């Protein structure tokens, strides 16, 4: 055994040992209990970043822990390969997105292998290969026939200078983020998943997920946004009917979740597209301009609530069916056409947004709810104004004294008897629009025939292969400019026809890849029945919190679709969910000759104990140390994990990632922290080396410890206490930094114990054999090497250390 720890001399050898034993290559073995541990698969962007290393180390800790506990562990990896990155790289580098992708995959795969993750590489998938995406085309065609996928006109943001469609997030002040050109709102036919048909199931099945973080479930519930409310129809006043047709001349229909406050409505608000707005705006230029501004807005969903709320009066009036009040209709920018009726009532005394709206425009506020003896102030909002649990109705005529639910029902009865309203359930959830006007993505398996319509491609003809010999040019989506692709024959009639040229939202590939890993070479279906039956659902999912809403909702939706197709028989894809925090680093800059800042990468900086400033490492010239934030290309503060691996080895990288912070917490890059991790591995190495240098290995202590000295009993107590703590940290708390600290304390106590005697050496052997197995999930290369110097058995067959209960009983006084 070499005296000094040298990662480059041990890490390739350990990886070859595991590869040869095929310990991570698993089959559907009915004799061993399955465990499916899955980390969110990466975009093959070029090289790993530190967020990747943290995610896949967490996954590997849990996977190796379960492996040592006797599970048949599947830990698969693959590549979320479609999307805009490869297209931008294509336009920047004049290479094919496919060529760029496959080169990146090969490089990043080598990186992952060098980190020693216990991955079943025989299950690798790449979502840009036709062997993968043919199956989501297949599912598309099956749901299209059932109407679960459908085609309808929708509105997109068109950038006329970049000649491409933009999401709301890429529209700034009504202009394209890169071009700076004014966006055009365009109506185009697009394809949608009817996810609203599954809203109730997606909402209610969240309650099954006892091992999901409560915040993720809360975010999903709020996104789905089910409400139990009331439809209410306000008769249009006789003087307000000019320009109105049909039922819009008879009544203004609204949806409210607070019909118990209907006696307190003081005005109503309609969307810019509402017929009442159209009729009112006919002779009023200010209304026309307000409507145009609303239609030209491109507010992203995450920003909708922060938008400043604005409105204009219409001079039109409706009548409250409960009390007979004549209320003025306003057009407001927060009322969205397509949500319910595109019209709401406003109760400023008991809804905070209505309070601020009415306070701005000096609209009336009428208290109809009282909470105890609390004072109502029409000039200042108080939280109890919105209370639904402990209020009773006041100023509400024959409804006074009722609580929320009782008043809800009485209003429902009153309105229904009059024909002026009825209870109604609504959902914020929109249908999922999947058409993308992009090249590097899964082709939509539809053929347009002037005789037959929009026709799904037959299953025998799938996949519709995306041609890979394409270099996007930036003057429009390439597929629409390639007749060699889109000119085809109709599969129903054989007539001249055109393939659909839009591609699929790349969320589609990540909505089912966890099932494909179960049988990634299965050519007769999305996933084979035998594999789906064996692996079931993902036992443990690990990924960033930024995916808590869309990706997880989409995956749960696809799981229920595939269940309803007979492909799987789980209701939920992921049993346990661990969401990791971001990785952050200090930033560095020098000021510009243009009064700005240029951001320097930390690897090109050297600091100069009490630290005082830093300078550029190539050419000494002091830079400004700046604030710490998420690693990004924006502030050029990304630390290349490859340089960390090159300088210290994979185990140091993994140990620092797991020790620096709990997974949910932000992990701050620290040079001293990395050095501390490496120093700890050197200490572990030296501890075993020095132990073996003073006598070589012995049989580890086991059994009755009567007659052991007090000092050795105390060390065995610490040993088996540490095993219990680490087991609980890996298995239950999923806090790995405290597990590492626990082993450090065991080694601290070992260091203070005289283990020179015969019984001392046996206990020392027991301590070291446990310590290297307790740390193997985190730093497997060094623990594999040290284990083999201590013991001739296969470490993974020795298994997870057991707690000796007898070592935890204390002497009787």
Ligand X SMILES: CC(C)C[C@H](N)C(=O)NS(=O)(=O)OC[C@H]1OC[C@@H](CCCn2cc(CCc3ccccc3)nn2)[C@H](O)[C@@H]1O
Q: Could you say which of ligand X, Zn ion, none residue 52 binds, taking C-beta under 5 to 8 angstroms by partner kind?
A: ligand X
Answer with the entry of Zn ion, ligand X, none that 449 interacts with (C-beta below 5 to 8 A by kind).
Answer: Zn ion
Interstrand relation of 326-332 and 267-270 (parallel, antiparallel or unpaired): parallel
User: 3-state SS string over 573-592?
Assistant: CEEEEEEECCEEEEEEEEEC
| Least spacing, CB of residue 492 vs Zn ion, in Å | 4
Task: Determine if 40 is a binding residue for ligand X (CB under 6 A).
Answer: yes
Q: Which residues have a Cβ under 8 Å from the Cβ of 442 and sit 6 or more positions away? A: 82, 127, 133, 136, 137, 466, 503, 504, 506, 508, 509
579-598 residues in contact with ligand X (CB under 6 A) are 582-583
Query: Which one among 145, 247, 286, 546 touches ligand X, defined by CB under 6 A?
Result: 546
Would you tell me the crossing angle of helices 97-114 and 641-648 to the nearest 10 degrees?
Answer: 30
Distance, in Å, from the CA atom of 715 to the CA atom of 754, rounded to the nearest integer, reads 10
Interacting residue with Zn ion among 451, 521, 533, 733 (CB under 5 A): 451
Side-chain half-sphere CA neighbours of 393 within 13 A? 23
Taking CB under 5 A as the rule, does residue 490 contact Zn ion?
A: yes
Of the candidate spans 14-22, 449-457, 540-548, 588-596, the one that interacts with ligand X by CB under 6 A turns out to be 540-548
Tell how strand 538-544 and strand 34-39 pair up: parallel
Query: If binding is defined by CB under 5 A, does position 493 make contact with Zn ion?
Result: yes
The contact mask relative to ligand X for 80-119 (x = CB under 6 A, - = no) is x---------------------------------------
Q: CA-to-CA distance for 615 and 598, rounded, in angstroms? A: 14
User: Residue 490's binding partner, choosing from ligand X, Zn ion, none, with beta-carbon cut-off 5 to 8 A by kind?
Assistant: Zn ion
Contacts with 525 (C-beta within 8 Å, 6 or more apart), sequence order? 135, 567
50 binds ligand X (CB under 6 A): yes
Q: Find the part of the chain contacting ligand X (CB under 6 A) among 50-58, 594-602, 679-687, 746-754.
A: 50-58
The one among 113, 221, 353, 551 contacting ligand X by CB under 6 A: 551
Q: Which of residues 676-705 bind Zn ion (CB under 5 A)?
A: none
Q: How far is CA 548 from CA 218, 512, 559, in A?
A: 10, 16, 16
Tokens of 40: 């969110």
> Which among ligand X, Zn ion, none contacts residue 232 (Cβ within 5 to 8 A by kind)?
none
Q: Is 632 in the site for ligand X (CB under 6 A)?
A: yes
Partner whose binding site includes residue 541, from ligand X, Zn ion, none (CB under 5 to 8 Å by kind) = none
Which residue has tokens 């026309």?
288
Q: Of residues 297-316, which lie at the interface with Zn ion (CB under 5 A)?
A: none
CB of 436 to ligand X, least distance (A): 15
| Strand-strand pairing, 574-580 and 538-544 | parallel
Give the torsion sign (CA, 501, 505, 508, 509). Answer: positive
Which CB, 135 or 267, lies closer to ligand X?
Answer: 135
Do residues 233 and 421 touch, judged by C-beta distance below 8 A?
A: yes
Stretch that binds ligand X, among 37-45, 442-450, 488-496, 755-763 (CB under 6 A): 37-45
Phi first, then psi: give them for residue 421, nearest 5 degrees. 170, 175
Taking CB under 6 A as the rule, does residue 49 contact ligand X? yes
Out of 631, 677, 712, 763, point to the residue binding ligand X (CB under 6 A).
Answer: 631
Q: For ligand X, which residue has the nearest CB?
A: 544
Instruction: Find the part of the chain contacting ligand X (CB under 6 A) among 331-339, 630-638, 650-658, 797-805.
Output: 630-638
Would strands 34-39 and 72-74 be described as parallel, antiparallel, or unpaired?
parallel
How far apart CA 465 and CA 447 sit, in angstroms, is 13
Examine residue 74 and tell whether it contacts ligand X (CB under 6 A): no
Q: Please, which residue, 213 or 386, has the CB nearer to ligand X? A: 213
Q: Which is nearer to ligand X, 134 or 547 (CB)?
A: 547
Q: Is 492 in the site for Zn ion (CB under 5 A)?
A: yes
CB of 601 to ligand X, least distance (A): 10
Q: Is 61 exposed, middle or buried (0-12, 13-18, 19+ CB in 10 A)?
A: buried
Ordered DSSP codes for 721-785: HHHHHHHHIIIII--HHHHHHHHHHHHHHHHTS---SHHHHHHHHHHHHHHHHHHTTTSHHHHHH
547 near ligand X, judged by CB under 6 A: yes
Q: Which residue is nearest to Zn ion (CB)?
A: 490
Residues that bind ligand X in the complex, under the rule CB under 6 A: 40-43, 49-52, 55, 80, 510, 543-544, 546-547, 551, 582-583, 630-633, 638
Residues that bind Zn ion in the complex, under the rule CB under 5 A: 449, 451-452, 490, 492-493, 495
């Amino acid at each position: 055994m070499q005296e000094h720890y040298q990662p480059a001399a041990i890490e390739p050898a350990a990886q070859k040992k595991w590869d040869d034993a095929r310990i991570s290559n698993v089959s559907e073995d009915a004799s061993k209990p399955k465990y499916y541990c899955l980390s969110m698969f990466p975009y093959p962007s070029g090289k790993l970043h530190m967020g990747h290393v943290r995610n896949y180390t967490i996954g590997d800790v849990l996977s190796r822990f379960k492996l040592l506990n006797g599970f048949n562990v599947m830990q698969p990896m693959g590549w979320d390969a479609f999307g805009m990155p490869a297209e931008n790289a294509a336009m920047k580098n004049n290479v094919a997105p496919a060529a760029w992708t496959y080169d990146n995959i090969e490089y990043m795969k080598t990186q992952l292998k060098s980190l020693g993750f216990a991955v079943d590489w025989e299950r690798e998938v790449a979502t840009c290969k036709p062997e993968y995406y043919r199956w989501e085309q297949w599912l598309f065609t099956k749901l299209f026939e059932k109407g679960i996928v459908y085609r309808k006109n929708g509105t997109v943001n068109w950038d006329p200078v970049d000649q491409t469609v933009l999401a709301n997030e890429q529209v700034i002040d009504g202009r394209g983020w890169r071009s700076g050109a004014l966006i055009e709102k365009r109506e185009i036919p697009m394809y949608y998943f009817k996810i609203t048909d599954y809203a109730e199931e997606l909402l209610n099945d969240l309650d099954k997920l006892e091992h999901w973080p409560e915040q993720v479930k809360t975010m999903q519930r709020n996104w789905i946004g089910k409400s139990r409310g009331m439809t209410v129809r306000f008769a249009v006043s006789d003087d307000s009917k000019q320009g109105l047709e049909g039922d819009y001349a008879k009544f203004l229909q609204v949806y409210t979740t607070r019909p118990d406050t209907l006696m307190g409505a003081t005005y109503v608000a309609v969307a810019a597209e509402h017929p009442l707005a159209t009729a009112a705006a006919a002779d009023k230029p200010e209304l026309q301009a307000f409507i145009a501004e609303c239609k030209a807005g491109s507010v992203a969903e995450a920003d909708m609530a922060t938008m400043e709320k604005k409105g204009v009066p219409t001079g039109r009036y409706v009548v409250n069916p409960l009390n007979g009040d004549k209320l003025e209709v306003w057009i407001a920018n927060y009322v969205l056409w397509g949500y319910g009726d595109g019209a709401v009532m406003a109760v400023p005394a008991h809804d905070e947004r209505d309070f601020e709206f009415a306070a701005k425009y000096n609209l009336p506020k009428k208290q109809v709810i009282a909470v105890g003896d609390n004072a109502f102030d029409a000039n200042r909002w108080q939280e109890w104004y919105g209370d639904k649990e402990n209020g009773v109705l006041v100023n509400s005529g024959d409804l006074d004294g009722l609580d929320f639910q009782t008043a809800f029902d009485a209003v429902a009865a009153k309105l229904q008897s009059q024909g002026a309203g009825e209870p109604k359930t609504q959902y914020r959830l929109r249908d999922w629009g999947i058409s993308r006007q992009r090249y590097w993505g899964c082709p939509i398996p539809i053929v347009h025939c002037e005789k037959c319509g929009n026709v799904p491609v037959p299953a025998d003809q799938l996949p519709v292969v995306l041609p890979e010999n394409v270099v996007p040019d930036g003057m429009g989506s390439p597929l629409a400019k390639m007749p060699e692709f889109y000119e085809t024959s109709c599969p129903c009639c054989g007539g001249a026809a055109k393939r659909e040229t839009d591609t699929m939202d790349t969320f589609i590939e990540s909505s089912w890849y966890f099932f494909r890993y179960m049988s990634p070479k299965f050519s007769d279906g999305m996933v084979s029945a035998e594999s789906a039956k064996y692996w079931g659902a993902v036992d443990q999912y690990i990924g960033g919190i930024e995916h808590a809403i869309l990706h997880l909702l989409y995956a749960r939706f696809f799981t229920k679709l595939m269940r309803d197709e007979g492909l799987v028989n789980v209701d939920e894809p992921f049993e346990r969910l661990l969401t990791q925090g971001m990785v952050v680093c200090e930033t560095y800059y020098r000021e510009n000759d243009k009064g700005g800042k240029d951001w320097i990468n930390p690897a090109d900086v050297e600091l100069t104990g009490r630290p005082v400033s830093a300078v550029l490492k190539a050419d000494g010239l002091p830079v400004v140390i700046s604030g710490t934030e998420k690693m990004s290309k924006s502030k050029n503060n990304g630390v290349d994990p490859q340089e960390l691996i090159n300088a210290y080895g994979a185990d140091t990288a993994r140990l620092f990632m797991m020790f620096a912070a709990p997974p949910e917490q932000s992990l701050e890059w620290s040079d001293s922290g990395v050095e501390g991790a490496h120093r700890f591995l050197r200490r572990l190495w030296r501890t075993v080396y020095e132990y073996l240098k003073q006598g070589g290995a012995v049989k580890a202590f086991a059994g009755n410890q009567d007659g052991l000295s007090k000092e050795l009993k105390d060390l065995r107590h610490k040993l088996h206490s540490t095993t219990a703590k680490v087991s609980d940290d890996y298995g239950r708390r999923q806090q790995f930094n405290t597990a590492i600290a626990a082993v450090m304390e065991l080694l601290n106590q070992y260091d203070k114990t005289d283990t020179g005697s015969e019984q001392g050496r046996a206990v020392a052997q027991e301590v070291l054999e446990a310590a290297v197995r307790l740390l193997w999930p985190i730093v497997p290369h060094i623990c594999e090497t040290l284990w083999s110097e201590l013991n001739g058995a296969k470490l993974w067959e020795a298994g997870w250390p057991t707690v000796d209960e007898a070592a935890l009983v204390k002497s009787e006084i």
